[PDB]
Design a protein around this ligand. Structure first.
Ligand SMILES: *[C@@H]1O[C@H](CO)[C@@H](O)[C@H](O)[C@H]1NC(C)=O
Ligand SMILES: *[C@@H]1O[C@H](CO)[C@@H](O)[C@H](O)[C@H]1NC(C)=O
Lengths: 50, 125
């Protein structure tokens, strides 16, 4: 009696589940800003729920 | 009250050099950049040059580049413009103008808030 290979079941379908929201993220307010800040006093902005 | 008075304009023959200046008063002179602007008789004005608030940096228009030189003196509250090899197309009423304090949007916008009086410079023979 000899051992040859392995047996494995293959998947059949694909499942994707993301939280459905539509708040487009505010990137323009940061990239298009008229005046930036000095490097020694850089400006931080948090981003969430986008 | 802020006011500027300039002097040194007059009639000269072609090929000479001039020296005129305006003396400021009523504000901290060292804290503001300055521009020279000329206006030909009957037409619109035209920008000429600019000097920084410490005199270490400057810029000029290409038309008068190589012939016009400016300078500053913080202590004496006077600023000079020197014309060399002056030509017939330099007849105008030169004003010395003060740089705009506040401009809001962007950093490349410039405007002149307070103007001078004017000196008539003409050339003939
Ligand atoms: C996803 O959609 C379902 C049904 O439309 C809704 O009940 C649920 O709140 C949505 N998820 C988010 C994060 O809005
Ligand atoms: C910023 O402005 C440009 C100008 O059209 C626009 O294309 C862009 O979507 C805006 N936002 C970002 C993040 O660049």
């Amino acid at each position: 009696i000899y051992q040859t290979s392995n047996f494995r079941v293959q998947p059949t379908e694909s499942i994707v589940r993301f939280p459905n929201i539509t708040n487009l993220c505010p990137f323009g307010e940061v990239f298009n800003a008229t005046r930036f800040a000095s490097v020694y006093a850089w400006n931080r902005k948090r981003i969430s729920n986008c | 009250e802020v006011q500027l008075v300039e002097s040194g304009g007059g009639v000269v023959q072609p090929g000479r050099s001039l020296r005129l200046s305006c003396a400021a008063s009523g504000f901290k002179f060292s804290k503001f950049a300055m521009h020279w602007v000329r206006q030909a008789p009957g037409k619109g004005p035209e920008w000429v040059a600019v000097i920084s608030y410490d005199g270490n940096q400057y810029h000029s228009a290409d038309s008068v580049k190589g012939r016009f030189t400016i300078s500053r003196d913080n202590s004496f509250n006077t600023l000079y413009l020197q014309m060399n090899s002056l030509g017939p197309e330099d007849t105008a009423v030169y004003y010395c103008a003060r740089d705009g304090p506040d401009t809001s949007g962007y950093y490349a916008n410039i405007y002149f808030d307070f103007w001078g009086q004017g000196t008539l410079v003409t050339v003939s023979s």
